[PDB]
Structures are given as C-alpha cells and as structure tokens.
Amino acid sequence: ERFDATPPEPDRPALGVLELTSIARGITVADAALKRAPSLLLMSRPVSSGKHLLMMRGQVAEVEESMIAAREIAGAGALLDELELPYAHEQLWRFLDAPVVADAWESVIIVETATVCAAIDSADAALKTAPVVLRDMRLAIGIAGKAFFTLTGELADVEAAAEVVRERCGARLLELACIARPVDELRGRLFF
Amino acid sequence: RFDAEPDRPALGVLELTSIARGITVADAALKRAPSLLLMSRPVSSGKHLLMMRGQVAEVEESMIAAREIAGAGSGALLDELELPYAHEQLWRFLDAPVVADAWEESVIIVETATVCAAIDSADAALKTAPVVLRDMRLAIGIAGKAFFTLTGELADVEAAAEVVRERCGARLLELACIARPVDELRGRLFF
Amino acid sequence: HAPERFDATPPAGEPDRPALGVLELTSIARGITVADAALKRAPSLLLMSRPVSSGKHLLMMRGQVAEVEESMIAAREIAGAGSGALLDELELPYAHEQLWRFLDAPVVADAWEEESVIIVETATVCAAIDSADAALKTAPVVLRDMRLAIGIAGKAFFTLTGELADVEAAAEVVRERCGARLLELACIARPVDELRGRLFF
Numbered sequence A: 001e002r003f004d005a006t007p008p009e010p011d012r013p014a015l016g017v018l019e020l021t022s023i024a025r026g027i028t029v030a031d032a033a034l035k036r037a038p039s040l041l042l043m044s045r046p047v048s049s050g051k052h053l054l055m056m057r058g059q060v061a062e063v064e065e066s067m068i069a070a071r072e073i074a075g076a077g078a079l080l081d082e083l084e085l086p087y088a089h090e091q092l093w094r095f096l097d098a099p100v101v102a103d104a105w106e107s108v109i110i111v112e113t114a115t116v117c118a119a120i121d122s123a124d125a126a127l128k129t130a131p132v133v134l135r136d137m138r139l140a141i142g143i144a145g146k147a148f149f150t151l152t153g154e155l156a157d158v159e160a161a162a163e164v165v166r167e168r169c170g171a172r173l174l175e176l177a178c179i180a181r182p183v184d185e186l187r188g189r190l191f192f
Numbered sequence B: 001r002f003d004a005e006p007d008r009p010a011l012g013v014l015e016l017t018s019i020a021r022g023i024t025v026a027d028a029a030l031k032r033a034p035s036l037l038l039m040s041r042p043v044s045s046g047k048h049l050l051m052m053r054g055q056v057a058e059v060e061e062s063m064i065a066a067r068e069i070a071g072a073g074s075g076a077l078l079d080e081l082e083l084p085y086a087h088e089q090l091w092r093f094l095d096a097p098v099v100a101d102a103w104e105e106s107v108i109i110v111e112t113a114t115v116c117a118a119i120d121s122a123d124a125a126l127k128t129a130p131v132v133l134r135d136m137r138l139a140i141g142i143a144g145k146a147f148f149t150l151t152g153e154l155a156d157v158e159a160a161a162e163v164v165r166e167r168c169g170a171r172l173l174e175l176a177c178i179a180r181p182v183d184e185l186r187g188r189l190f191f
Numbered sequence C: 001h002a003p004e005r006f007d008a009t010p011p012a013g014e015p016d017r018p019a020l021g022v023l024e025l026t027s028i029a030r031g032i033t034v035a036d037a038a039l040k041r042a043p044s045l046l047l048m049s050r051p052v053s054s055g056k057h058l059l060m061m062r063g064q065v066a067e068v069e070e071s072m073i074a075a076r077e078i079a080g081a082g083s084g085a086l087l088d089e090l091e092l093p094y095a096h097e098q099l100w101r102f103l104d105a106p107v108v109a110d111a112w113e114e115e116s117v118i119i120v121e122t123a124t125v126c127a128a129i130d131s132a133d134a135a136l137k138t139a140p141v142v143l144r145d146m147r148l149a150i151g152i153a154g155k156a157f158f159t160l161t162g163e164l165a166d167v168e169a170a171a172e173v174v175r176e177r178c179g180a181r182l183l184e185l186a187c188i189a190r191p192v193d194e195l196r197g198r199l200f201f
Helices: A023-036 A060-074 A114-129 A155-172 B019-030 B056-070 B117-126 B154-171 C028-040 C065-079 C099-104 C125-135 C164-169 C172-181
Strands: A013-018 A039-047 A052-058 A079-083 A107-112 A133-139 A149-152 A174-180 B011-014 B036-043 B047-052 B077-082 B106-113 B131-136 B148-154 B172-178 C019-025 C046-051 C057-064 C087-091 C116-122 C140-146 C157-162 C182-188
Touching: A013 A023, A013 A060, A013 A114, A013 C116, A023 A039, A023 A052, A023 A114, A023 C116, A023 C182, A052 A060, A060 A079, A079 A114, A107 A114, A107 A155, A107 B019, A107 C182, A114 A133, A114 A149, A114 A155, A114 B172, A114 C087, A149 A155, A174 B019, B011 B019, B011 B056, B011 B131, B019 B047, B019 B056, B047 B056, B056 B077, B077 B117, B077 C140, B106 B117, B106 B154, B106 C028, B117 B131, B117 B148, B148 B154, B154 B172, B172 C028, C019 C028, C019 C065, C019 C125, C028 C046, C028 C057, C028 C065, C065 C087, C087 C099, C087 C125, C099 C140, C116 C125, C116 C172, C125 C140, C125 C157, C125 C172, C157 C164, C164 C172, C172 C182
Parallel strands: none
Antiparallel strands: A013 A052, A013 A079, A039 A052, A107 A149, A107 A174, A133 A149, B011 B047, B011 B077, B036 B047, B106 B148, B106 B172, B131 B148, C019 C057, C019 C087, C046 C057, C116 C157, C116 C182, C140 C157
16 A cells, blocks of 8 residues: 555655665665655565565655665665666556566567666656556566566557667666567466 | 367476566467467576477477577577476476375485476386376476475386486486385475 | 474473474485484474475474484484585574574564664574574573575574663674674664564565
C-alpha cells in the first residue's frame, strides 16, 4: 500500500534508490538517511548474492536530503549504485517490491542490467519517452543480483525505448533483446 | 506438458548465461520448428533455463536455430542437452524441485555443475538398471548447480553410478553411494 | 521429524539435548555422506539436512555433549577425505536458549523494548552462530534478527539490541570469535523511530 502511485494523503513523487554490498552498513545508511530528512523508507531488503537494497519515497527536497546523507557515510565504501528519480513514472511504482510476471498481453524489449538501479533508471527513462507498457520486472532476487524487465507496445516505440535504455545504462547493460513479434507460446507469458 | 496429443519423446534443454539472450533463443527455436516450450525460467546464479518438447526431428531442428543465436554474440550457451527418447520417470522432475517423503535399499546422490549434466546422467542411469528417481533440484537455490538421488538394489545403483560417471565427464562434482542409509535418513534426505 | 526439535527446552520425558553441532560443506552429496556417519557413530538428533545458497550443504545436530562430540569427530573424518569439502564447523556444548529459535528459518523482529543495536555480518553460517552464542553469554543483549546463507549467497547476519555499553561489550567479543570470518560490523547508538523494531521489510 506504500508503493501506490497515487496516495488516498501527502504526495511522494520522488524515488530514492540505494544499492549496497554490506547488509550491516546498509542498515547504517538507512539510519542517517531518515535522520536528516523525513523520507518514507519503502524497503530494507537483503538480496541475492548478499547485496542490500534501499528504496525511499517522499518529496523532491526530502528525498534529495536523505540521499546526500546516505552517500557520505556510504564511503566513511560499500555503495554499489544509486538512483534518484524526482518524478518517477506511474507504471514504475507497482514494479518495485515483488518480482512481477505478466499474465497476458505485440512487440517487446528485454533489458538485462547488472545492477538494480540500472534497471529502474532504464525503465523510467523509456516509459516517459515512448508510449510503451512495463509488463515484467525482477530485481536481484534469485538472479545473482542482476536485473531485467520487459517493455511492450508498437514496434517503433519499442525500438525508440531500446536506444534510450542503451544510453543511460551504459556499461551497466548486459544485453538488450528486441523482438518485433514473438510466437504465440511467448506472447503473454514470457516467463514460466 | 511435463507429462510422459502427438507423442513427443524428445527433450531439449538449454542453459543460457543471459536471460535476455535466453528469450531470443526460445523465439528462434519455435519459428523454425513447432516444439512444445516446456520452460522459460530464470534460475539462480543469473542463468536462464530453456526446456522444449517435441518429436526427435522437431527438437533437433529447434536446437540448430538455438545454437546459432546462443553463440551469435561472444557466446552465451553454458551447456546443452538433446535426448531423443527420455525415460518416463524423468518428466515429473523437470518443473519444480522434488523431495521424497519416504521410500518403498541403497541410494546414490549425484552433484553436477550444470543442469544439462544432471538430467543427462539421470536419463542414462535410469536406462541401465532398475533404479528409482527420488529427488532432484535444478539450479534454483543452489547457485546454478544441480543434484538428484537414485535408489534400488546395491549392485544396481552401483551399475547406474558408473554410467553417471561417464556421461557427466568433467561436469561431475561429486558422487556418493550409501549402501545402507541410517533409518532416520531413509526417505527424507532433505529437511 | 518432530517440529519441536528446535525448541530450547523439550517437554518432560524427552532426553536433554543442550549441545549443538553445525557443519558447512562445499558439497551437498558429501553432506549426505557425512550426516550418515554422524547418526551411525552416535545417537544425535539431526536438526536439518539442508542445501542453501552458494551451493553449500548445511548440517545441524543436537544431543548430549558426549554424543554430538562423537558425531562431529566422524563428521570431520569423512568431510575431509581426499580434498576436504568442509568449509567451517561449530561445536557448542551448551548453546544459549535464545539462539535456538533462529536456526531453522530466517527471523525478522517486528518490535523492540526501550536502545542501541549492532548488526554483525559473517562469511560462514558457523561464524554467525558462534558469534551470537558468545555475545549472549557475555552481555545482557537480545537477538532480534538472523539469516543463515539462504537468499544472501552463503553469507550470514544477525542483530543484537540492548544498552550501548552492552552492545559495545558484545562487539569486541564477536570480533575475537569471528576472526577473519567477520566482514562488516555496524553499530548504531540511537536508531531512528522508523527503524526501531522493523529493520527488514
């Protein structure tokens, strides 16, 4: 209920992400973060391969302050990657907690990234570039810390989103697979 | 699906080190031959596992298109399997990990580096001696490694173990043959 | 197997089993072979025969001090054959009461009692349990969280709460017990209210 894109009351559009290699220090990071600013900690999650993952939510000013305090003690270095999206896309909020496998769905891209921050930053950039739909997403858990997601829509939009992800990911991208029209035994449920 | 419709005795198994590359291989395998895609599942250690089912000619043709895409870049195929006529016991152990509750004896436990090594050796072992497949865990939860257990007569399970040895080659991590399990362990080997 | 096997105190009529023995093996098949030698050698109660993350096998057993010690000897003999598959090993003659309910499944606390807290992070499961038991019988602390290998690639962690002096006193003991097996040891003097009780979610 705290992952809702729309609150019933204060509005929290900003999304702060912290990916750490130490679970212990990862908790230390969370303390200092919520100390300097009243952000809303979305999750404190020990994940696959032993990494720790922090997600926070709040106003732009609140999140920004918590992230600065987080970085300073993160090297006092166990900080793997960071992400701050002042205005996260609405389709992205429901793909933060549990690994979502799509039920039923044309064209699709499959983005394979090295870190969790790379995935969330890539899906977001693509969701606000072309009218595409985020179908699946898995973050670190069960897949050795790696991350992947899928984006569906018209062919041209899928291609457009492919170049967007390819740019802001950089060396964090492992492979991007673009299929114009998958088989009927793939259309709908890509993972089973 | 994972049972034992036209008879589809052939089993194709693909271990791809990339989940993105994996879903591309699955699309290429089906567009060149009408196999039944049993599995498209990301497993532990960030690997991707593909399992297909069809006639020997269907699978054979699908795996050709698979190996073309799997090595298209700079390599992404960890291991592969192609069993024209897989044993009947081997089918209900492919979907999810199976733990035996109790036995009906000796036992052999095989630890393999890849999943393709496990299913291949289990297939070979089953066809050489009256052994019963009991447990099997593939990649998930154990960093990509795979294992299984076989039971039966002492001389029989040791005849099956020698077959596992050869079919695995360097993919064999460990083989254990317990002639007479302790009574508190007969059945539930994992708890 | 009786679900009450992890209970710190068995009912009246059941034998006393205060000792604890833990085995970490790099091989799962070898792990089964080792467990076989354990129960055959001595009548110890096998707590778990469990494969976990990083592909290692996890074994725990309980019984009288003389029994578990006898099973552990036969364990090390088999686990070390050829090239030893044994990664680490623990033997506690009288494991602390609080320690028992954390062995089986991962446990996350949902509340505290009024304030400091330490978070220990080890490389092996044995290093975690051994570090927890020593602290609990050194300082008046309370074990809140613990996770053994599963979901974190073989690593392990636990949390201890209490007064700042108590968690400090239970810090350098963990360091001496862990040795090189310790990764990171965090300490928090005054945790924020939002983190009090619920550290993992």
